[PDB]
Design a protein around this ligand. Structure first.
Ligand SMILES: Nc1n[nH]cc1-c1ccc(Br)cc1
Length: 123
């Protein structure tokens, strides 16, 4: 149907916007602490602590499959990256501190992303 095509165009547009947002957010992680999944070989007990692991590579996989239907779903995954890290790692660690900085700097980006999604009507 034409309606289905239009819906798919909207999703493709959202995906383009979220790709830009994801690039901007990952730039706020210059240490690449959040670039890849926590290794279950190097941290074998990780899943005892963290029930829903997340990282930028995994987000990017879902993104390119057009797997984010709206900004909320994307933000959920970004918050998992931050929140998982701030639970597993103590306050005095380079990991926890990196998550705080990513959260703070990323908030700015996500604030305008929300305005843009609403403005252009992408969801
Ligand atoms: N990036 C993370 N999110 N949750 C835990 C971690 C982590 C834990 C140990 C090391 Br070593 C590195 C990273």
């Amino acid at each position: 149907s034409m309606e289905q095509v239009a819906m798919e165009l909207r999703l493709t547009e959202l995906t383009r916007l979220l790709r830009s947002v994801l690039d901007q957010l990952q730039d706020k992680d210059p240490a690449r602490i959040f670039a890849q999944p926590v290794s279950l070989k190097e941290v074998p007990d990780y899943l005892d602590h963290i029930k829903h692991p997340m990282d930028f590579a995994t987000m990017r996989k879902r993104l390119e499959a057009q797997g984010y239907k709206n900004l909320h779903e994307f933000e959920e995954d970004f918050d998992l990256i931050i929140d998982n890290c701030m639970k597993y790692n103590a306050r005095d660690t380079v990991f926890y501190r990196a998550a705080v900085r990513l959260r703070d700097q990323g908030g700015v980006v996500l604030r305008q992303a929300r305005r843009e999604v609403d403005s252009i009507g992408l969801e």
